[PDB]
């Protein structure tokens, strides 16, 4: 056999990000009190990349109602770094089940690169029934 | 030919290292657990045909297992990987097979890899036991080591030959 130059090139040119953090803990979440945890992503690849949080399995939205990512999609030039905020806000739609306990402060976000890999971010923590 | 392959099995068994060995022909002992799902391209040749392998490497941690079943859909061949030094990882292979039966194609090609065969001092799973389980399910088996470069290339070529053979018949 011989050197797989084509494979080396194609792998090197696949979309890629570096994430500053993948595990998020929201301690003592309260009713109608906003908490934010930020992290950074950089395009450490050789090609521009489109990123977006996407629904998991057969879900309608990319995350639970009490959670948002901002921005939740975008386009990054190679070597470009942006901050993303994970925002937790429990309204009266989420409380019934958070006080009941058939839902807790847990979620997983799937960040997808177009034509590329996915990164998983894990959210944990606790709610204090107001 | 483009074959989508998928590596599954418990966290820590060596999936990322097996892929790194096959695609980069190297071993790095400081890999972190996979938090997400990745893929790499590796081209091989069979019957004078160039076959592009697109190989997806999954997160084996429990909390991601359900999410990860979403990615089984396109798979044409699946490596089931356990760690010869971890009896639990081997016990779980039957459970991984059930996952394949549920979430993958009924005619997906499968292969069992008993990885870390370089660590025989800490071996918990005998080669005979691996072979017999594979036999029970009618699927191919071999012991591998991403560290010592044992059988990694052989495993992948074998899986791809099986896929290609099946496809040519139709
Ligand atoms: N001795 C030896 N160690 C290995 C071998 N293959 C992998 N390892 C080691 O076993 C540990 C886990 O390897 P890794 O490839 O990350 O496992 P994984 O299946 O990808 N885990 P995950 O599902 O969490 O991503 C690492 O310390 C790695 O260096 C091998 O063939 N021999
Ligand atoms: Mg891994």
């Amino acid at each position: 056999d011989s050197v797989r130059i084509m494979d080396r090139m194609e792998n090197d040119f696949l979309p890629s990000l570096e994430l500053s953090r993948r595990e998020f803990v929201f301690e003592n979440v309260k009713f109608r009190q906003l908490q934010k945890e930020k992290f950074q992503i950089s395009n450490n690849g050789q090609v521009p990349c489109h990123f977006s949080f996407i629904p998991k399995l057969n879900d309608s939205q990319y995350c639970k109602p009490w959670l948002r990512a901002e921005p939740f999609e975008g386009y990054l030039e190679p070597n470009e770094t942006v901050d993303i905020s994970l925002d937790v806000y429990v309204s009266k739609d989420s409380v019934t089940i958070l006080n009941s306990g058939e839902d807790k402060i847990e979620d997983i976000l799937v960040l997808h690169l177009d034509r590329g890999k996915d990164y998983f971010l894990t959210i944990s923590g606790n709610y204090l029934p107001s | 030919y483009l074959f989508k392959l998928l590596l599954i099995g418990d966290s820590g068994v060596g999936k990322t290292c097996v892929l790194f060995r096959f695609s980069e022909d190297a071993f790095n002992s400081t890999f972190i657990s996979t938090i997400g799902i990745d893929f790499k391209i590796r081209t091989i040749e069979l019957d004078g045909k160039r076959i592009k392998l697109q190989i997806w490497d999954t997160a084996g941690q429990e909390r991601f297992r359900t999410i990860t079943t979403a990615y089984y859909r396109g798979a044409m061949g699946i490596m089931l990987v356990y760690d010869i030094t971890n009896e639990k990882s081997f016990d779980n292979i039957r459970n991984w097979i059930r996952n394949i039966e549920e979430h993958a194609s009924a005619d997906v090609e499968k292969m069992i890899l008993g990885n870390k065969c370089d660590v025989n001092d800490k071996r918990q799973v005998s080669k005979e036991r691996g072979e017999k389980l594979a036999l029970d399910y009618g699927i191919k088996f071999m012991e591998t080591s991403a560290k010592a470069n044992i059988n990694v290339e052989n495993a992948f070529f074998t899986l791809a030959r099986d896929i290609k053979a099946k496809m040519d018949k139709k």
Side-chain angles (χ1 to χ4, degrees):
Chain A
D1 196 18
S2 42
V3 182
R4 297 164 20 242
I5 300 177
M6 269 184 55
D7 290 345
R8 227 279 92 68
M9 292 301 285
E10 183 166 355
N11 287 313
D12 283 350
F13 276 82
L14 257 21
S16 176
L17 303 178
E18 178 173 294
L19 324 206
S20 65
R21 183 188 178 182
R22 296 188 205 196
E23 322 285 324
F24 301 89
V25 179
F26 291 82
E27 291 185 4
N28 303 310
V29 174
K30 313 184 195 183
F31 183 75
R32 276 191 143 74
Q33 288 188 26
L34 183 60
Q35 285 190 224
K36 307 193 294 282
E37 296 194 351
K38 300 170 204 304
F39 67 103
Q40 289 209 153
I41 68 175
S42 294
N43 189 162
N44 62 173
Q46 316 288 100
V47 303
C49 79
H50 173 65
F51 67 91
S52 58
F53 293 93
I54 61 167
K56 315 169 287 291
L57 288 173
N58 289 299
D59 292 356
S60 65
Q61 324 284 159
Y62 68 80
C63 76
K64 289 183 190 182
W66 47 266
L67 178 63
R68 292 294 188 288
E70 177 65 35
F72 76 96
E73 62 176 356
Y75 186 75
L76 282 194
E77 297 311 324
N79 292 87
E80 181 185 356
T81 80
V82 76
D83 297 299
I84 298 173
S85 198
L86 298 185
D87 297 353
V88 170
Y89 186 92
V90 183
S91 295
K92 217 178 185 50
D93 57 316
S94 295
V95 288
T96 169
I97 57 170
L98 286 175
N99 291 339
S100 168
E102 195 144 38
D103 193 44
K104 193 201 181 176
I105 303 308
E106 52 181 58
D107 214 355
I108 302 173
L109 309 175
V110 185
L111 178 64
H112 173 65
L113 303 182
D114 181 49
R115 293 190 155 256
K117 71 187 82 175
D118 293 0
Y119 304 85
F120 305 152
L121 310 188
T122 305
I123 292 75
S124 67
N126 69 293
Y127 186 54
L128 296 163
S130 204
Chain B
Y1 287 104
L2 161 73
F3 299 166
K4 177 185 165 173
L5 308 186
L6 184 72
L7 319 166
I8 61 174
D10 286 10
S11 182
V13 298
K15 301 186 297 300
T16 295
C17 287
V18 165
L19 184 57
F20 193 68
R21 173 58 70 170
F22 184 57
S23 66
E24 305 313 289
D25 189 33
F27 178 78
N28 171 66
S29 65
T30 73
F31 274 147
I32 179 190
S33 183
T34 307
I35 318 303
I37 188 172
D38 193 16
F39 69 92
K40 295 307 162 199
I41 282 61
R42 163 111 190 213
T43 297
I44 79 290
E45 188 184 301
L46 267 29
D47 304 320
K49 298 300 293 178
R50 234 156 68 90
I51 322 284
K52 183 199 279 154
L53 304 178
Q54 187 188 74
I55 309 162
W56 296 69
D57 175 28
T58 56
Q61 287 187 57
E62 310 186 4
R63 70 170 174 305
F64 300 134
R65 277 180 212 167
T66 310
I67 299 310
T68 295
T69 63
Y71 306 88
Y72 288 35
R73 182 164 75 72
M76 297 170 77
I78 299 179
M79 298 298 192
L80 296 134
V81 189
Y82 67 94
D83 172 348
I84 62 124
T85 69
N86 186 311
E87 177 66 35
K88 183 56 184 164
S89 71
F90 182 70
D91 300 337
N92 288 341
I93 287 296
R94 307 165 173 279
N95 298 305
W96 290 112
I97 285 164
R98 176 176 303 101
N99 259 58
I100 302 322
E101 293 172 353
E102 289 173 334
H103 298 105
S105 175
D107 76 314
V108 70
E109 295 299 320
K110 303 171 295 315
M111 178 169 294
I112 297 170
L113 267 26
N115 189 51
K116 309 193 193 177
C117 73
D118 56 299
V119 194
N120 273 274
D121 291 324
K122 295 177 177 170
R123 174 187 288 276
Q124 297 177 14
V125 183
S126 80
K127 178 180 186 52
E128 306 180 322
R129 281 171 48 50
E131 295 173 331
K132 177 62 182 339
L133 175 65
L135 212 193
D136 283 355
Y137 280 97
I139 71 185
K140 277 165 183 273
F141 162 87
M142 63 188 79
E143 291 195 345
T144 65
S145 170
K147 188 179 170 184
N149 195 28
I150 298 176
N151 275 332
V152 170
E153 216 185 288
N154 188 31
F156 281 98
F157 279 79
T158 301
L159 185 59
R161 276 198 197 90
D162 283 327
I163 298 163
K164 185 176 190 292
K166 188 178 214 158
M167 250 183 104
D168 284 347
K169 286 172 194 204
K170 259 350 189 247

